[PDB]
Ligand binder design. Structure first.
Ligand SMILES: *[C@@H]1O[C@H](CO)[C@@H](O[C@@H]2O[C@H](CO)[C@@H](O[C@@H]3O[C@H](CO[C@H]4O[C@H](CO)[C@@H](O)[C@H](O)[C@@H]4O)[C@@H](O)[C@H](O[C@H]4O[C@H](CO)[C@@H](O)[C@H](O)[C@@H]4O)[C@@H]3O)[C@H](O)[C@H]2NC(C)=O)[C@H](O)[C@H]1NC(C)=O
Ligand SMILES: *[C@@H]1O[C@H](CO[C@@H]2O[C@@H](C)[C@@H](O)[C@@H](O)[C@@H]2O)[C@@H](O[C@@H]2O[C@H](CO)[C@@H](O)[C@H](O)[C@H]2NC(C)=O)[C@H](O)[C@H]1NC(C)=O
Lengths: 112, 129
């Protein structure tokens, strides 16, 4: 698609992991807001961060994020088994629809 | 908000299908109805951001003219917690227009993040076959 990710990231239980989103100038981080969504396969999405760093209601403080001129980042502290699901980031403006990128899977290491 | 999808359809190429979701427990006219699909061979594609209060619609260039979006008048069951429904018709379905379709309630009424999907329904299956 237009908005792309690394496709696969990983990290150990209890540690931090970073997921990044990049793309062409038409999806440049300097003009459009980046949202993040948990999207397990076969189940409804859950909103995580509506705007680069604004945490959605009910989301534990271990989820946070930041943005750079050329990229957007979601930081997940203290990975848990339920965090294995694929996460997606879609960019948007107040007067245009959110455009969805590719997903990133998370491998949570050290499980029984 | 208990956004509930009416159900799945199993259509043939060239048919028209109306996909609908119902609400219960929030003010229908306060938030947008977001139509989004997840396709097995592509993943989430998005479809459109339709307002139930006004006639304003924001439709992806990919789907202009193909799909007609509309909402129903809300039913005031109780103040601040109304019911209602919205639906869209997708014309001239292709083999690519398969997979799982979702309805979603908008996050906020104002601010830079308004119209953004927040509360997602259960979803329905479309086989186009
Ligand atoms: C009764 O309640 C209804 C429903 O809640 C209110 O309608 C909402 O009102 C808010 C505030 O006005 C709306 O938010 C605004 O959305 C605009 C998008 O609409 C324009 O652009 C799209 C293009 O995608 C067109 O389709 C559409 O026709 C419009 O032309 C934003 O552009 C607005 O942005 C404002 O704020 C940002 C910062 O946050 C600034 O950058 C902008 O310059 C601008 O000032 C704004 O976000 C919301 O969309 C409406 N929701 C619905 C469901 O309709 C009514 O306003 C309210 N009635 C009264 C009298 O208060
Ligand atoms: C935006 O508001 C709606 C509507 O609830 C409003 O806020 C509540 C805290 C309360 O003051 C209500 O009277 C207001 O109308 C939120 O939707 C749900 O509201 C109910 C109210 O009983 C609440 O218990 C639920 O947890 C709310 N959430 C869901 C998912 O149903 C909505 O969550 C608010 N959005 C944000 C981003 O905060």
């Amino acid at each position: 698609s237009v908005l792309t990710q690394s496709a696969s990231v990983s990290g150990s239980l209890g540690q931090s992991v970073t997921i990044s989103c990049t793309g062409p100038n038409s999806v440049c981080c300097s003009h459009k807001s980046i949202s993040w969504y948990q999207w397990p396969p076969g189940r409804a999405p859950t909103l995580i961060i509506y705007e680069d760093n604004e945490r959605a209601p009910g989301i534990s403080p271990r989820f946070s994020g930041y943005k750079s001129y050329w990229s957007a980042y979601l930081t997940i502290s203290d990975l848990r088994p339920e965090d294995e699901t694929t996460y997606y980031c879609c960019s948007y403006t107040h007067n245009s629809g959110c455009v969805f990128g590719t997903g990133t899977k998370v491998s949570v290491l050290g499980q029984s | 908000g208990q956004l509930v999808q009416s159900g799945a359809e199993l259509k043939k190429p060239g048919a028209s299908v109306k996909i609908s979701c119902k609400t219960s427990g929030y003010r229908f006219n306060f938030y947008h109805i977001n139509w989004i699909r997840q396709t097995a061979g592509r993943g989430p594609e998005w479809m459109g951001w339709i307002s139930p209060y006004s006639g304003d619609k924001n439709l992806a260039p990919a789907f202009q003219d193909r799909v007609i979006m509309t909402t129903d008048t809300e039913v005031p069951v109780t103040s601040f917690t109304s019911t209602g429904a919205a639906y869209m018709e997708i014309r001239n379905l292709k083999f690519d227009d398969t997979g799982t379709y979702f309805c979603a309630k908008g996050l906020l009424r104002d601010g830079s993040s308004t119209w953004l999907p927040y509360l997602w329904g259960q979803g329905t299956l479309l086989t186009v076959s």
